[PDB]
Design a protein around this nucleic acid. Structure first.
Ligand code: DTP
Ligand code: CA
Ligand code: CA
Ligand code: CA
Ligand code: CA
Ligand code: CA
Length: 901
DNA sequence: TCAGGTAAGCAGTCCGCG
DNA sequence: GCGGACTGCTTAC
């Protein structure tokens, strides 16, 4: 087999690499890598190395990496560019793996671990590590085993061994319900003292050294805690055994308002699953506790126990250990679904970076572009310092607030990357500038044609047309991968709808789910069998379809994020190829494209309707348009349609056969106007939206920019079994809105769009009447909490104190002296509730850590003093008032002359 | 919130507005 | 009471 790296490090003048050799075995080597860097040289000097602009370079081979680094410094001292890859391990990987890497995940050791630490004096600070580690569960992907290290004897209590038999029993049997499918995979090791636990753990670690290390909050908690605890007990050298090269560094993580410390373990790639989730999931959650995320992703109930976590080991060690094991399993279950580890490995090996670098698009692209250029003996420029400067972004159309009955939407496929490819935007393809006219002049095609030679953007930039830039070349490759995965995602989605339809008529039989590949549209034969399956088999198929769709979503949206990151990287001062000429070339072209095509679509539709000056495009944002289809529907007449699906077909056909050809013609003209290299503006139909046929539903509404709701029947070719709301920006979509309020507001919107005014008024009256019974957590607002210290003045709100920060200070006074009460963590999220006049907390709100119940010693007082009226008005009524006035509707029935009877 | 761009919405504070 | 200047937070792209 072809070899592949596992990890790579520079330690002094040595490269330390762990790798899989040609026989599939893990090996480690130290290599005295001699790096090369480059300097510009005279034309008369024969060379095969050229910078990206075609200027000749001489290669400078160094005795060692430190010599190379010192040379860079001296070149700065002289004032001359020092060219080439200055991150020497990336150059080492490029030299060592000079081919597309084919990796085998089954040979990569993926460790997932979680530790427990009993602490009677509050949160166990990792940097102090003053409390014993009393449990470690460590799952190894190669062994497929959960290794459990259990401390029986502690200063905080002596306990009995954990029982696997009790662990397997139902909660209703007094057991822990450790899933039966992992029971046989547990390797349980009890220890009489902490020193032997940790020594054995380190020996185990040497034997089974993680390549990828993950878990929940492992980078901020588990790793620093284990490292510091071992350091405290045994000394530094023993703690450094966590690194296979015995090298570690305390790394200071700085944010806007403070810093924290993590431990870098050389020769290990730490991918904390919380950070994987935050980057790759495209959610924003009210809380990031594992119990909250597990419930969200897997629909598993919260791990329940009595009393504080600090007394759980002494009161119920059995449950203590079981929940440690389950917590490790939950992360593995999330990953089986979301496949973020597989994503990281894919992207990492593609770019030829340290796997943990997938968190940085700048580093990822720097390595992709470097490897690409290196193949052509081209030499990358030196990174430079740039002051951060603002620059212009997308255009967003100001919509007229209103109901909109029938709507078809269209938007560009991979807009910014397609602009890059079309215009040929790259560092080395810059050809010059042209004198710019107002943007309006290009939009309306009255401005002079920018160039008869070069490919142009309306920001004034011109680009070569003879060859593709390295940015268009490399972005195309990742775009093509994205497209393949999106194909699989959409097929799984369509397949899902086939199953949902069949579930309307399940068969009374005993059978199995069909063995099918959900990434491909079901054949006629599969469809026929599905129509004969039981509800049990259908639901199992639906679950598998949806898992396939999730896998496709992960693969596609994060490849989309990567290529969109390259467009963004051109406006990031840390990027090697930072250039505001190129960043603005993209964004300004985007602004032109949207407004150009708005004009074109308006012109086309006024023509087919025999009108003049009417606006069919009601809205657009960045690369999208929303077209009113009322007149198209009315041209055939609603009476002519058999059912909803009938007019959806008609609009689908109209969009595909009339709109899209018109749109394509408009963009082809724009391509030629800008003299672009290749037409790649593909604005495909997204949504077909409208009320159910014969209903009083309003179909859709806008309140303003980035705030709208549509009742959608077909989305990018997926015809829904049931209509689905596309809601953007409104309070139902914000993590700050109370959960129960999101639900109620969503139902209000559903009723508005599908059923009409009367239905809405019915639901509002009921929600208003019953909402005080809602659980306090379900009606609490949510906010991130930054700068708590800034606004704290002797425990009281300072000037300009934010409402949520005020809440935290109220909490802090109410729990003062309690070393045990949960502390609000700076930068994390809190629930927030308003408090009625004259409450014992002495202020208008209280806040507490999100994802948790408020501590018992104030809970009853919070509940008693909760201001339900203020809560209702702020989170429910005011947004609803916004929705209904926009839609020209009333949420409360107006008096009429019929009331006289 | 270490990690990737800008546009733009709403909550809330402070304070003006005769 | 609303709105403008401003901060904070959170979305849509
Ligand atoms: N998370 C992001 N980071 C940077 N730029 C973004 C992001 N989301 C959107 N953009 C910019 C770049 C996109 O090309 C452009 C249009 O957004 P959007 O329509 O959501 O994606 P897209 O056009 O790239 O892909 P799709 O093919 O799924 O529509 O807005
Ligand atoms: Ca725990
Ligand atoms: Ca798009
Ligand atoms: Ca059937
Ligand atoms: Ca879009
Ligand atoms: Ca599309």
């Amino acid at each position: 087999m072809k070899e592949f790296y596992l990890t790579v490090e520079q330690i002094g003048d040595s490269i330390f690499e762990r790798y899989i050799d040609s026989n599939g075995r893990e090996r480690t080597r130290e290599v005295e890598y001699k790096p090369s860097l480059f300097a510009h040289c005279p034309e008369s000097q024969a060379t095969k190395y050229f910078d990206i602009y075609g200027k000749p370079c001489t290669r400078k081979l160094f005795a060692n990496m430190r010599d190379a680094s010192q040379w860079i410094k001296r070149m700065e001292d002289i004032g001359l560019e020092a060219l080439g890859m200055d991150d020497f391990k990336l150059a080492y990987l490029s030299d060592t793996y000079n081919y597309e890497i084919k990796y085998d995940h089954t040979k990569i050791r993926v460790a997932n671990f979680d530790i427990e630490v009993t602490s009677p004096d509050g949160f166990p600070e990792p940097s102090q590590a003053k409390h014993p580690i009393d449990a470690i569960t460590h799952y190894d992907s190669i062994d497929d085993r959960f290794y459990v290290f259990d401390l029986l004897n502690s200063p905080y209590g002596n306990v009995e061994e954990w029982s696997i038999e009790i662990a397997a029993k139902l909660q209703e049997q007094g057991g822990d319900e450790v899933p039966s499918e992992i029971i046989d995979k547990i390797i349980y090791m009890p220890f009489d003292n902490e020193k032997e636990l940790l020594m054995e753990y380190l020996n185990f670690w040497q034997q089974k050294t993680p390549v990828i290390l993950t878990g929940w909050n492992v980078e901020s908690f588990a790793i620093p805690y284990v490292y510091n605890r071992i350091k405290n007990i045994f000394g530094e050298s023993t703690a450094k055994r966590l690194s296979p090269h015995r090298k570690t560094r305390v790394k200071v993580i700085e944010n806007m308002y403070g810093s924290r410390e993590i431990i870098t373990l050389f020769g290990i790639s730490v991918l904390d699953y919380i950070d994987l989730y935050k980057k790759f999931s495209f959610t924003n959650q009210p809380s990031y506790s594992l119990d909250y995320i597990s419930e969200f992703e897997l629909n598993v109930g919260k791990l329940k126990y009595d009393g504080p976590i600090s007394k759980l080991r002494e009161s119920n060690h059995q449950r203590y250990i079981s929940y440690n094991i389950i917590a490790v399993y939950r992360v593995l279950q999330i990953d089986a679904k979301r496949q973020f580890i597989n994503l990281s490995l894919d992207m990492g090996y593609y770019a030829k970076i340290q796997i943990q670098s997938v968190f940085s698009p700048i580093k990822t692209w720097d390595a992709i572009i470097f490897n690409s250029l290196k193949e052509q003996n081209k030499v990358i420029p030196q990174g430079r310092s740039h002051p951060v400067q603002p620059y212009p972004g997308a255009f967003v159309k100001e919509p007229i607030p209103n109901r909109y009955k029938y709507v078809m939407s269209f938007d560009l496929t991979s807009a910014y990357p397609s602009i890059i490819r079309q215009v040929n935007i790259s560092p080395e393809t810059i050809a010059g500038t042209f004198k710019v006219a107002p943007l309006h002049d290009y939009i309306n095609a009255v401005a002079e044609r920018p160039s008869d030679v070069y490919s142009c953007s309306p920001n004034g930039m011109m680009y070569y047309k003879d060859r593709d830039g390295v940015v268009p070349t490399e972005i195309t490759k990742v775009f093509n991968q994205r497209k393949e995965h999106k194909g699989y995602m959409l097929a799984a989605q369509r397949n899902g709808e086939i199953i949902k339809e069949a579930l309307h008529n399940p068969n009374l039989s005993v059978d199995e789910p069909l063995d099918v590949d959900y990434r491909f549209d079901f054949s006629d034969e599969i469809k026929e069998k599905i129509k004969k399956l039981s509800a049990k088999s259908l639901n199992e198929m639906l679950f598998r379809a949806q898992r396939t769709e999730v896998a496709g979503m992960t693969a596609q949206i994060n490849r989309k994020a990567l290529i969109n990151g390259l467009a963004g990287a051109l406006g990031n001062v840390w990027f090697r190829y930072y250039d505001l000429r190129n960043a603005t070339a993209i964004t300004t072209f985007g602004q032109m494209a949207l407004q150009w095509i708005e004009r074109k679509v308006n012109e086309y539709l006024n023509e087919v309707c025999g009108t003049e000056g009417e606006a069919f495009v009601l809205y657009g944002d960045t690369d999208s348009i929303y077209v009113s289809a009322d007149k198209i529907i009315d041209k055939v007449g609603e009476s002519k349609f058999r059912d909803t699906n009938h007019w959806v077909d008609f609009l689908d056909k109209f969009a595909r056969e009339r709109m899209e050809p018109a749109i394509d013609r408009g963009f082809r003209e724009m391509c030629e106007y800008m003299n672009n290299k290749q037409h790649l503006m593909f604005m495909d139909r997204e949504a077909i939206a409208g009320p159910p046929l014969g209903s009083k539903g309003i179909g859709g509404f806008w309140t303003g920019k980035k705030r709208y709701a549509l009742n959608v029947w077909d989305m990018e070719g997926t015809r829904y079994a049931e209509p689905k709301l596309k809601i953007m920006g409104l309070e139902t979509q914000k993590s700050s809105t109370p959960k129960a309020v999101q639900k109620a507001l969503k139902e209000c919107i559903r009723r508005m769009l599908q059923e009409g005014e009367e239905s809405l008024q019915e639901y509002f009256k009921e929600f208003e009447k019953e909402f005080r019974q809602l659980n306090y957590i379900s009606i609490a607002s949510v906010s991130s909490a930054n700068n708590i210290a800034k606004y704290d003045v002797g425990g009281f709100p300072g000037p300009k104190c934010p409402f949520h920060i005020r809440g935290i200070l109220t909490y802090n006074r109410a729990i003062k002296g309690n070393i045990d009460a949960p502390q609000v963590v700076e930068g994390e999220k809190v629930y927030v509730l308003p408090l009625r006049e004259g409450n014992p907390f002495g202020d208008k709100c209280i806040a507490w850590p999100s994802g948790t119940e408020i501590t018992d010693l104030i809970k009853d007082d919070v509940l008693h003093w909760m201001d339900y009226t203020v809560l209702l008005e702020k989170t429910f009524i005011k947004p609803l008032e916004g929705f209904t006035s926009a839609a020209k509707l009333d949420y409360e029935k107006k008096a009429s002359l019929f009331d006289m009877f």
